[PDB]
Amino acid sequence: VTRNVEVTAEEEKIRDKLGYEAIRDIHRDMDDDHSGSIDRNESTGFMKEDMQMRGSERTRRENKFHGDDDAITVDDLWEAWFESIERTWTNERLVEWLINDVNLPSIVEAVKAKKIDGKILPRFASPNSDFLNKELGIKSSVYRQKLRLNSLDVVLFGYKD
Ligand SMILES: [Ca+2]
């Protein structure tokens, strides 16, 4: 029922439609002037305001997000996410993260049953809150908020800990 095949980022936009659309929603949320690209002022601004990140936490992440690219398009963001090690996380690795970093043991049995993996992280991180609420059944607003922000951090800037 399942086979392992080499796919391109473009092909995966179609196959992982909900993940791509999540990445696109995140990008629109960060793209404050709607230019279609995220600049260094927008990305740090987003960290500062929407992710409530202190100055000392931002510069490392700015560099990871941008590199030498001063203007991150949706395609750029999708490509970086598509290529990321975190997208490859197993269900096991994802549960390890929920326990050790996010501290949300209450959602673990749902995550395990649904067999979701690293590919779900953008949907966790999406400013459209319907997936965490309705699909995973996370009733707590506080819990959703915390998973969303931790997922954003990992989707946008990679895992570090
Ligand atoms: Ca912009």
From Swiss-Prot:
Ranges of residues in domain EF-hand: 18-53
Source organism of this protein record: Caenorhabditis elegans
SAM domain mapped to chain residues: 89-157
Name of the protein described by the UniProt record: Stromal interaction molecule 1
Source superkingdom: Eukaryota
Role noted for this protein: Plays a role in mediating store-operated Ca(2+) entry (SOCE), a Ca(2+) influx following depletion of intracellular Ca(2+) stores. Acts as a Ca(2+) sensor which upon Ca(2+) depletion, activates the Ca(2+) release-activated Ca(2+) (CRAC) channel subunit, orai-1. Essential for Ca (2+) and IP3-dependent contractile activity of gonad sheath cells and spermatheca. Essential for fertility. Does not play a role in posterior body wall muscle contraction (pBoc) rhythmicity, intestinal cell oscillatory Ca(2+) signaling or intestinal ER Ca(2+) hemostasis.
Tissue-specific expression: Coexpressed with orai-1 in spermatheca, gonad sheath cells and intestine. Also detected in neurons in the head and in the uterine epithelial cells. Heterogeneously expressed in the intestine with strong presence in the anterior and posterior intestine and weaker in the midsection.
Mutant lacking the gene: phenotype: Sterility due to dysfunction of somatic cells. Affects the store-operated Ca(2+) (SOC) activity.
Portion of the full sequence shown: 25 to 185 of 530
Cell compartment(s), UniProt: Membrane
Oligomeric and partner information: Homodimer. Interacts with orai-1.
UniProt: Ca(2+) binding residues: 31, 33, 35, 37, 42
